[PDB]
Design a protein around this nucleic acid. Structure first.
Lengths: 35, 209, 103, 85, 105
RNA sequence: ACGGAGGGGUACCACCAGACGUGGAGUCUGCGGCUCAAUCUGACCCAACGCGCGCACCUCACCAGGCCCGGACGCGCGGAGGACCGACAGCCGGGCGCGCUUUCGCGAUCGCGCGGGCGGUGGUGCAUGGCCGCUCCCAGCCCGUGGCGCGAGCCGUCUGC
RNA sequence: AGGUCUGUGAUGCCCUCAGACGCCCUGGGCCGCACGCGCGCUACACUGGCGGGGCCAGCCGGCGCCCGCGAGGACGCGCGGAGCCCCCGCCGUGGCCGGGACCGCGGGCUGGAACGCCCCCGCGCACCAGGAAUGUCUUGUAGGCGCCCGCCCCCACCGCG
């Protein structure tokens, strides 16, 4: 029963053609997939 | 002077192939029920495999333009891991079906699955055998033939052998299982052909004039 | 030419093995010789309980599988690569009787 | 948990890079080719079984058979084993 | 449970080119040695028993094939309905026939 | 069928003549009882008791604990404006993204309900098949025509050697 | 109404079926012990035990060199068979050098993992031919002596020979 949360706008890391996300892909950063 | 660790390859290369034959017997028996399947044989020619079949009506298994046979050949090869086109097959036809127990018992199973009573089926089988030239046939049908309390009633006609080495030559036996709503109905057949092939039954003397 | 070839044939029943023997001897008299060696019989033995459940008197089955083996290595140089074929196809094609050829 | 390391003292003592001896039994080359997947079937062990009825008990490995004693009397005549003497 | 499409296509093609598939009764982890597919994976990659077994279950349920179990081996054969279905997943054109009809003898 | 009825035969799973043993001790193994969370179960005169082919894991059923769905196939609804499925840090935990404080991913290979499957060393061997054991280390069992009896039955198939 | 639904893609009718009697993992147990009995093994000694030497089998069958008291181990190649018995000595009727259970230090093998199996030094249990009762046996037989296969990662007082 993981407590996930719902967001319809999964597309606003950027403002307008920007590079917000650290091709493609507190405690530092934790990258998707492997480490 | 000789090493026994090398000929074990020849000896173990015969055993494996004898086993490979039995799996085929089982598979055909579960498959070619409608083609009068009886038996099988094999010939491990190095280039390619050959298998010889014994069927009442091969044209059924032959299939229009040899389609069923060919569908079979490619199949076996994958399982036994041989290059297809080296896994050819041949079919041979039985002419004395009444002397073959397997054909008879399978026919009986069919007739039983159509609800006909046992008393007619058995004696039709037995007439068919005698017409073929046989000295005896015995049929047995054990199971829950009535409401409950299963019993075996056996039908026969002629004379039969039951003991001795000769029972491995002149006596042909087979069995099946029939699944029905009440339960399972065991059925078995045995036929006696004393003048089979060319061998002569012992304790049988013929005199001259 | 000369390739020291050897013929080995194996069977489980003693009646064809002796029939195959005679055919080969008949068909190899010219392409050199082909006298046989009869090996000791390898007999496989398996003892099993006659019962699937283990009830009553302890009674046993005694199966076995005798395997007979004969060896004509007499071709030797007396047979070429194709010459071995000649006879091997002229001999009867008994359904079961394993055969292997080696130099 | 990739970011999990251990003291070097606790590393050389680890089992030498050797293939676990338990190899299972592949009666034929066909039946194999080498979340839960981490521990689905990690207890590798011999799993020799009858090549007819699949039972793991009373299996004649002699002569490279791999047939149960019960599953044997039936097919023995087909194979060629016979009862004499 | 999550099967790649390369695997589907591979199985179907193996069927058409051989009109059959004899498969082990197995459920532990392993790789089938026959049917192979390439997805940039080395030269070729072999599948896993799990995916193929689920696939075959579905196919036979739909009526495409007909089993004939034996000494703990699965023996499948494609029928006519199955042919009339495999012929379109692969994008095959009408009239094309499988190899066993190609007069092996 | 039985007879502490008679008459003929037979066999070291019967005796005579003899031989070698067991029941005596220590120990291996199996069987009932006690104990335990569990000490998994079948078989009980001959015709149960090293027998159901060697139990540290598997085998394995029983005890204390945890992952997974591998829910086929049909109808209704929903879904890519996102069905389902994986993971770093840091704990809780025997352990594992098992669960937890968070946010990255993957992409219809489907989700839910209703019918319907698959599977199960789960019960009944007093519902069954098949295979064994015993009756039986036996010598006995039957058909056609005919004859005797209302008939069940008898003769054939023998009170001799 | 003998045994087997726990050998099987042999099965009728029941029961279980998403906190599962399905499948997979970690541990424990099937071996625990005041007691009754079934098949076996070892002995109770001089028609003997210990030490040294000589020598012959069959189902069938694999060996060299070097370390280590040994069990075992590192390398490298295809080649190959025993107990009783016989000969010479010691012991000298003493629960003694008969017997080898139990226990205390130590060295190794299998395996992912010893609770398992082998070897060495020391300690040295019952047992003096066995009550009422009972089993098997006629020539290469009984008995005595050992050797191979099966199951098996290791292990035979068992079983087939």
């Amino acid at each position: 029963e993981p407590k996930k949360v719902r967001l319809a706008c999964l597309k606003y890391y950027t403002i307008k053609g920007d590079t917000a996300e650290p091709n493609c892909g507190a405690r530092h950063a934790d990258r998707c997939h492997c480490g | 002077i000789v090493r026994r660790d090398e000929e074990n390859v020849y000896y173990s290369k015969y055993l494996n192939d004898c086993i490979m034959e039995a799996e085929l017997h089982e598979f055909f028996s579960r498959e070619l029920v409608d083609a009068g399947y009886a038996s099988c044989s094999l010939c491990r020619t190095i280039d390619s495999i050959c298998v010889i079949i014994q069927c009442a009506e091969p044209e059924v298994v032959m299939g229009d333009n040899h389609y069923r046979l060919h569908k079979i050949e490619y199949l076996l090869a994958g399982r036994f891991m041989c290059d297809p086109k080296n896994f050819n097959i041949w079919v041979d036809k039985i002419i004395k079906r009444g002397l073959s127990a397997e054909i008879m018992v399978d026919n009986l199973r069919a007739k039983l699955e159509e609800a006909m009573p046992i008393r007619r089926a058995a004696y039709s089988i037995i007439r068919t055998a005698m017409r073929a030239g046989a000295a005896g046939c015995e049929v047995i049908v054990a199971g829950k033939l009535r409401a409950q309390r299963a019993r075996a009633n056996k039908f026969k006609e002629g004379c039969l052998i039951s003991t001795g080495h000769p029972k491995r030559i002149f006596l042909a036996e087979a069995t099946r299982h029939i699944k029905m709503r009440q339960g399972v109905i065991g059925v078995k057949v045995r036929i006696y052909n004393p003048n089979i092939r060319g061998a002569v039954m012992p304790d049988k003397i013929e005199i001259g004039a | 030419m000369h390739q020291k070839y050897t013929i080995i044939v194996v069977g489980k029943d003693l009646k064809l093995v002796e029939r195959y023997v005679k055919s080969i001897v008949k068909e190899g008299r010219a392409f050199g010789i082909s006298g046989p060696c009869r090996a000791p019989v390898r007999r496989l033995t398996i003892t099993t309980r006659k019962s699937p459940c283990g009830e009553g008197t302890n009674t046993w089955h005694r199966f076995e599988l005798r395997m007979y083996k004969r060896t004509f290595w007499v071709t030797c140089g007396g047979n070429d690569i194709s010459t071995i074929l000649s006879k091997t196809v002229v001999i009867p094609g008994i359904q079961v009787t394993v055969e292997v050829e080696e130099p | 948990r990739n970011l999990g390391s251990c003291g070097a003292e606790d590393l050389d003592s680890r089992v030498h890079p050797s293939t676990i001896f338990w190899p299972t039994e592949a009666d034929n080359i066909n039946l194999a080719s080498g979340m839960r997947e981490t521990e689905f079937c990690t207890h590798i062990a011999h799993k020799r079984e009858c090549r007819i009825c699949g039972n793991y008990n009373s299996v004649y490995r002699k002569y490279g058979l791999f047939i149960c004693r019960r599953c044997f009397k039936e097919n023995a005549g087909k194979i060629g084993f016979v009862k004499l003497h | 449970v999550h099967i790649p499409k390369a695997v589907y296509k591979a199985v179907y093609a193996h069927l058409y080119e051989n009109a059959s598939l004899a498969l082990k009764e197995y459920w532990r982890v392993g790789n089938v040695p026959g049917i192979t597919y390439v997805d940039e994976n080395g030269k070729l990659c072999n599948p896993t028993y799990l995916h193929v077994n689920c696939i075959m279950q579905s196919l036979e349920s739909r009526g495409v094939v007909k089993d004939t179990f034996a000494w703990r081996h699965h023996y499948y054969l494609l029928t006519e309905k199955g042919e009339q279905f495999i012929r379109k997943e692969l994008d095959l054109t009408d009239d094309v026939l499988p190899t066993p009809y190609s007069k092996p003898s």
